[PDB]
Amino acid sequence: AECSVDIQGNDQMQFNTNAITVDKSCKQFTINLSHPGNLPKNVMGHNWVLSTAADMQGVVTDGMASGLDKDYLKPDDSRVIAHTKLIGSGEKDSITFDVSKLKEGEQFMFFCTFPGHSALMKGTLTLK
Ligand SMILES: [Cu+2]
Known part of the structure; x- marks a missing residue:
């Protein structure tokens, strides 16, 4: 019914x-990300990245090593199901993805890959 979430x-x-539900009747699902802080992208950037629970650590680790120009994501990372761009204070960005990409019998996590942020900036994403 709701096929979107504001984050x-x-x-x-x-x-x-830290917990997102995706109604299975949704053909697509949309994340509307915003940054109500004061700090710029280079030191307080945020993105919203979705992977399986198992793939999170790898996406985070490799993302951190990728640098700012790459939005702290490994280019062509096969583990990333969907992602917004990286944004700083006052910016916003949306990502819409096909719900068909989320299989039953799997755990998913969302998180920000800006260096260090995933300690706090993470949670679960679950079909409903
Ligand atoms: Cu962040």
């Missing part, structure tokens, strides 16, 4: 949710 990342490196 915020702030200067305190908090997402305003």
Whole structure:
């Protein structure tokens, strides 16, 4: 019914949710990411990245090593199901993905891959 979620990342490196539900009747699902903090992208950038639970650590680790120009994602990373771009204070970005990409019998996590943020900026994404 709701086939979208609004999510915020702030200067305190908090997402305003750590559990997202995706209604299976949704053909597509949309994440609307915003940055209500004051700090710029280069030191407080936030993105919203989706992978299986198992793939999270790898996506984070390799993303951190990728650098700012790459939005802290490994280019062509096969583990990344969907992702917004990286944004700083006052910016916003949306990503819409096909719900068909989420199989039953699997665990999914969302997270920000800006260096260090995933300690706090992460959570679960679950079909409903
Ligand atoms: Cu972040």
